[PDB]
C-alpha cells in the first residue's frame, strides 16, 4: 500500500503466469467486410416540458 516491495513476491513467484478469460470477436478469415446498422429519430420534445 505504501510503495516498498512486498517480500513474499519473489522473483520465482512473480514469473508464474496468470490465467484469465475474455470474450474475443474478430472477422472470419475469408470475409470481405462488416456491416453495421441502426436508425435515428429526430423529434420536437424540447418545445414544452414533459
Amino acid at each position: 500500500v505504501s510503495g516498498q516491495p512486498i517480500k513474499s513476491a519473489t522473483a520465482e513467484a512473480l514469473a508464474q503466469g496468470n490465467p484469465h478469460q475474455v470474450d474475443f470477436c474478430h472477422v472470419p478469415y475469408g470475409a470481405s467486410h462488416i456491416e453495421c446498422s441502426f436508425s435515428v429519430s429526430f423529434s420536437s420534445e424540447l418545445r414544452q416540458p414533459y
Binding site: 446498422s37 441502426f38 436508425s39 429519430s41
Partner: protein, 41 residues
C-alpha cells in the same frame, strides 16, 4: 345494451426501434424502470 368491440393495431417502427409499455408502481444497482407484463405461452 352490450356493444363489444375487438380492436387490433399494427405499428411500423424504424429499424430496431424502441417500444414503450406501461410500467409498474414500485412499492448494488436499483431498477429504474420496471415494466408491466403478462404471461403469453
Amino acid at each position: 345494451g352490450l356493444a363489444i368491440f375487438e380492436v387490433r393495431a399494427t405499428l411500423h417502427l424504424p429499424t430496431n426501434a424502441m417500444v414503450r409499455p406501461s410500467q409498474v408502481f414500485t412499492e448494488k444497482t436499483q431498477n429504474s424502470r420496471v415494466f408491466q407484463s403478462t404471461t403469453i405461452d
